[PDB]
Amino acid sequence: PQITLWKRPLVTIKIGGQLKEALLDTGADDTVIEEMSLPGRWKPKMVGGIGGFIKVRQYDQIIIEIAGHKAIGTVLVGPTPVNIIGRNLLTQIGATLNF
Amino acid sequence: PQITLWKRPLVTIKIGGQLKEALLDTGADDTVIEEMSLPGRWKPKMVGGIGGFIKVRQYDQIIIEIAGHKAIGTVLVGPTPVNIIGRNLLTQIGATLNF
Numbered sequence: 147p148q149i150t151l152w153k154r155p156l157v158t159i160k161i162g163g164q165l166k167e168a169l170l171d172t173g174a175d176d177t178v179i180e181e182m183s184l185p186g187r188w189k190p191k192m193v194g195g196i197g198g199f200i201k202v203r204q205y206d207q208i209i210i211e212i213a214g215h216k217a218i219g220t221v222l223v224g225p226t227p228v229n230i231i232g233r234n235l236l237t238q239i240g241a242t243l244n245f
Numbered sequence: 246p247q248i249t250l251w252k253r254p255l256v257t258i259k260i261g262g263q264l265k266e267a268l269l270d271t272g273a274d275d276t277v278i279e280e281m282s283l284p285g286r287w288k289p290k291m292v293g294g295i296g297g298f299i300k301v302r303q304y305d306q307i308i309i310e311i312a313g314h315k316a317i318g319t320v321l322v323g324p325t326p327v328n329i330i331g332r333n334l335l336t337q338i339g340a341t342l343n344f
């Protein structure tokens with residue numbers, strides 16, 4: 147699809163067996179999802195933005211369906227105010243910014 | 246252009262006669278720029294990013310060039326770690342997300 151930017155570019159994702167809404171975010175290096183359980187090992191990380199940093203759990207090799215496109219990668223889990231699909235997974239679905 | 250996302254989507258902007266680097270950020274509603282001087286009056290605004298809320302100065306109707314495309318619109322000035330071009334100006338340059 148072609149998604150215009152008049153509105154937030156929200157899509158449905160499936161992660162850990164759960165359907166969620168998430169933002170397609172070219173300004174995010176990494177994918178950051180609100181607190182939920184995921185299987186396997188994790189390690190702590192800090193991620194920073196406007197307003198400062200939050201502590202997250204970094205889970206590697208997590209499969210996420212994004213607008214019906216499968217992608218695998220690292221997912222960060224923590225107290226983000228919105229679910230964010232960052233560049234690490236946008237690349238895998240072939241997303242580009244065009245103007 | 247068509248911009249892939251394997252690297253950060255950094256572009257040159259021109260504002261107040263000065264070249265700066267900024268991030269094209271589809272997850273940002275608003276354009277937020279590091280401390281600089283801008284003409285005219287400003288209004289208050291609170292911006293809620295990943296780590297919390299910050300105060301910014303809102304300047305309306307500011308001339309800004311983005312990757313060689315001319316925009317005139319709202320710029321927020323405050324302590325962001327990176328200059329970010331949000332959807333209010335991405336729409337002015339005709340940007341879309343495609344996959």
Ligand SMILES: COc1ccc(S(=O)(=O)N(C[C@H]2CCC(=O)N2)C[C@@H](O)[C@H](Cc2ccccc2)NC(=O)O[C@@H]2C[C@@H]3CCO[C@@H]3C2)cc1
Nearest residue numbers: 173174175176194195196272273274275293294295326327
């Ligand atoms: C390492 O991986 C990441 C690091 C930081 C973030 S981030 O969420 O902080 N952010 C990074 C950007 C903004 C600062 C910067 O230098 N780069 C991703 C953004 O798209 C973020 C994504 C976002 C975070 C929190 C709330 C909503 C969106 N949007 C955002 O901060 O927008 C600001 C806040 C205001 C709300 C939305 O628009 C307004 C302008 C995401 C992943």
Ligand SMILES: [Cl-]
Nearest residue numbers: 192193194195
């Ligand atoms: Cl970070």
Ligand SMILES: [Cl-]
Nearest residue numbers: 218219220234
């Ligand atoms: Cl990854």
Ligand SMILES: [Cl-]
Nearest residue numbers: 237240249250
């Ligand atoms: Cl590619």
Ligand SMILES: [Cl-]
Nearest residue numbers: 318319333334
């Ligand atoms: Cl505007």
Ligand code: NA
Nearest residue numbers: 186187206207
């Ligand atoms: Na894992």
Ligand code: NA
Nearest residue numbers: 285304305306
């Ligand atoms: Na003004």
